[PDB]
């Protein structure tokens, strides 16, 4: 009778307490990451100073890393493909780049590389090159097709990554490089590189790219917890109502 | 006038003493630098570890800086042209590069770039591009044509430097850039750079350093200096004894 209903009401009130305190700690983690994101922690000095001057300098969009989202599986490949370009700054125009350069020079604030969005042009494999590789067993993907980004930046991201192939292993990068006459850069899932011409880079032993991925994850989980909480408050209100009368 | 001879004798004795001390400090600097070389000091960890294993791993020739010799007047330009590529390791083949990369990975020994001789692609301007600049007063050379190396590494050296133009000065570099439709990187003898798209990078003064080529240059300078100091010293020793002797024959 009332013994089972009081037990169930207690499971729900306790689970409601768990979820609220858990949500509070999850929000605290989101805020820590948001602060790190918007303080530009981990960025090179000149890049940090330009982004801190978004409210003074004209035409500053953001660093490349801020503009793309990459799954965890492909993060090492994309970071390796980009190299220093992770922190290249997308700006409206070459004029905007020159103003930011002057701002850095005058203040002694370091150095940065700029990508003028009105002028930068996409790269892409030809249709025959793509067909030459995209069913090879080591092929993972064209680097630009492995990331997400707003359409406004499509020519900038194609420029940096539309001619970069991601392969599953280094032998596969060698194989596909040959099929492509060593015209293009290939990167493996583990971060080894076959550069145009056949040079090979590798070895081994926290990425800026994991920050907006964890932030997006925390965001979705927070929405999930708010509905878990709403559901648990309904269950508490429910088992109270039948029980109250 | 015996006094003028005694003073000339004291001069030569003073020069001989100072030259001996100077030679000795120069010898010590030479030995110290040769020890750094033997330690692979200044190489990044991954390159150091491959070179230490160069007789265990197959097909390891060596780092670019070990395989080229650069005339003193071109050292600054070539070191600037190469940058970190003076530590790229020439190897027999892709398989050899893969085994070396596997060695670095499994031991946590860092990263390195490898140049596999069997495939590595040479680079060169077109005939018409070379003709447009070849006779310009500020043209010094194609970087790969200013450095010495054994013929076996020709494609590896051209890959790194066949598309880099060395110029007399920056005004000449900018003239040559326009003649080449801004397609190539130019380096002056003083180390200034004109690169395609270079107006999009800048800010404060860059000042990085990984100057393994400059250690080789200093070692060649010390070798040549030490030979000169040896001859100076032996000359001064003979002049001191000759003047001391001629001074004693005249107090008769």
């Amino acid at each position: 009778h009332m013994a089972a209903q009081k037990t169930e009401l207690e499971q729900h009130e306790a689970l409601l307490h768990q979820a609220r305190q858990y949500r509070q700690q999850t929000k605290a983690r989101q805020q820590w990451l948001e602060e790190m994101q918007h303080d530009y922690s981990g960025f090179v000095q000149g890049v940090k100073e330009v982004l801190k001057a978004r409210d003074l300098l004209p035409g500053i969009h953001g660093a490349i890393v801020e503009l793309i989202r990459v799954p965890d599986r492909y993060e090492t490949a994309i970071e390796t493909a980009l190299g220093g370009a992770m922190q290249h700054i997308v700006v409206d125009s070459e004029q905007a780049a020159r103003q930011a350069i002057h701002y850095l020079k005058t203040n002694g604030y370091g150095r940065a590389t700029f990508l003028p969005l009105d002028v930068i042009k996409a790269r892409a494999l030809s249709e025959r090159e793509r067909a030459a590789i995209d069913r090879h067993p080591a092929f993972v993907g064209i680097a630009s097709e492995l990331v997400e980004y707003d359409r406004a930046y499509r020519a900038a991201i194609a420029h940096l990554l539309g001619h970069v192939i991601v392969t599953a292993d280094l032998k596969g990068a060698n194989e596909l490089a040959k099929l492509l006459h060593y015209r293009y850069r290939l990167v493996t899932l583990d971060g080894d590189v076959v550069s145009p011409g056949g040079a090979m880079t590798g070895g081994g032993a926290a990425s800026l790219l994991s920050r907006n991925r964890e932030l997006e994850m925390l965001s979705a989980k927070l929405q999930e917890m708010d509905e878990t909480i709403a559901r648990l408050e309904r269950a508490v209100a429910a088992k109270r109502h039948e029980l109250a009368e």
Side-chain angles (χ1 to χ4, degrees), chain A residues 98-118:
Chain A
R98 279 183 254 114
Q99 291 189 61
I101 279 157
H102 175 67
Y103 172 83
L104 288 181
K105 183 144 52 215
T106 292
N107 289 285
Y109 274 169
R111 305 177 93 246
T113 300
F114 300 89
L115 311 160
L117 192 62
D118 57 351

Side-chain angles (χ1 to χ4, degrees), chain A residues 19 31 49 88 124 150 163 204 209 223-224 231:
Chain A
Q31 172 182 334
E49 289 303 332
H88 288 7
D150 188 281
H163 61 142
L209 299 166
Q223 294 176 12
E224 186 183 329
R231 175 180 61 71

Side-chain angles (χ1 to χ4, degrees), chain A residues 22-245:
Chain A
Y22 196 24
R23 171 185 124 79
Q24 198 260 123
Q25 290 267 17
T26 299
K27 237 173 145 190
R29 172 66 178 169
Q30 177 190 54
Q31 172 182 334
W32 192 85
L33 277 174
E34 182 272 315
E35 185 166 3
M36 276 188 93
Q37 174 199 23
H38 288 137
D39 286 348
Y40 308 110
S41 85
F43 281 88
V44 152
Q45 156 170 84
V47 174
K48 191 182 295 195
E49 289 303 332
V50 169
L51 301 178
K52 291 167 122 226
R54 265 161 53 73
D55 291 354
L56 176 66
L57 298 167
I60 312 300
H61 285 247
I64 286 293
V65 64
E66 303 180 281
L67 274 14
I68 62 175
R69 315 181 289 284
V70 57
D72 169 84
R73 176 165 174 84
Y74 306 120
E75 174 187 278
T76 292
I78 292 310
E79 185 163 6
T80 310
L82 291 170
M86 284 269 287
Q87 297 185 45
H88 288 7
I89 302 169
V90 173
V91 302
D92 294 3
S93 71
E94 297 162 87
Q95 176 61 253
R98 279 183 254 114
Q99 291 189 61
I101 279 157
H102 175 67
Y103 172 83
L104 288 181
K105 183 144 52 215
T106 292
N107 289 285
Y109 274 169
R111 305 177 93 246
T113 300
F114 300 89
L115 311 160
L117 192 62
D118 57 351
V119 152
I120 198 182
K121 298 307 186 178
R123 290 156 174 148
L125 296 212
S126 76
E127 184 180 308
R128 282 210 298 260
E129 292 174 321
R130 179 69 171 263
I133 72 180
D134 68 1
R135 285 180 300 188
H136 190 282
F139 175 80
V140 173
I142 303 309
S144 60
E145 303 181 358
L146 261 13
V147 302
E148 314 291 326
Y149 52 89
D150 188 281
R151 183 261 176 263
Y153 303 117
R154 173 191 308 181
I157 304 304
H159 180 85
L160 296 169
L161 295 177
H163 61 142
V164 179
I165 300 95
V166 179
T167 70
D169 53 31
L170 186 49
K171 176 71 189 283
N174 284 130
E175 291 165 341
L176 292 174
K178 197 171 185 278
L179 290 180
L180 301 159
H181 314 291
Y182 301 91
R183 304 189 47 207
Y184 302 113
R185 175 167 328 266
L186 306 98
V187 181
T188 73
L189 292 173
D190 200 39
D192 302 329
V193 179
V194 178
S195 75
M200 291 166 66
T201 300
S207 189
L208 293 178
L209 299 166
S210 81
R211 183 178 291 147
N212 71 20
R213 187 175 63 251
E214 189 182 348
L215 270 167
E216 181 177 17
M217 172 257 148
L218 286 170
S219 176
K221 192 84 144 284
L222 282 181
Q223 294 176 12
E224 186 183 329
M225 300 181 161
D226 290 332
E227 175 50 30
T228 289
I229 285 169
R231 175 180 61 71
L232 283 163
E233 300 159 318
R234 278 181 262 132
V236 167
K239 281 92 202 291
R240 185 289 314 166
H241 192 58
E242 47 174 330
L243 206 50
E245 331 205 316

